[PDB]
Amino acid sequence: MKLSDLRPNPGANKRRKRVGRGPGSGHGKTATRGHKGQKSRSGGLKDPRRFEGGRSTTLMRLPKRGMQGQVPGEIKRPRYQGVNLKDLARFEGEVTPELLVRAGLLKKGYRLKILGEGEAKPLKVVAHAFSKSALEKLKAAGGEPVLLE
């Protein structure tokens, strides 16, 4: 191989759109920007995601739901992340919150709760909460559920 040999695959380094450089480019003069108007002007339009031209916005006109929170703010209560059985097939033996984190299944700070969308394996599982469905599958599949405190 050789430096002169090193191309990028076709299409992975596209050119750019230079506006304002002549009639030929089809981008000259008005720079693909229109004629007059707040949009052609520099700076341009207020956030088009929201503003609508003065009228009450679509989002401001929608009603607010539920609790919006208060100060000091968020309340701390234990948090649960659920993992499905099928996602547990890969392991052998004894599953815990830890390994399921270092595997990339359970995030830290959250507790472990087993779900049932899959099929149990006669495995020792340790967690903080199972589902009615998950248990039946887990006890039926010769497994050993183990809740925590």
């Binding site: 989002l59 929608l62 607010k64 739901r65």
Partner: peptide, 25 residues
């Protein structure tokens, strides 16, 4: 994040915008 929205609406799992129904305040 625009909070005027996160307090009114909610994005589903498929990419839709679901806001409560206007009229009964």
């Amino acid at each position: 994040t625009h909070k005027g929205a996160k307090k009114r609406v909610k994005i589903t799992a498929s990419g839709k915008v679901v806001a409560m129904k206007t009229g009964k305040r």
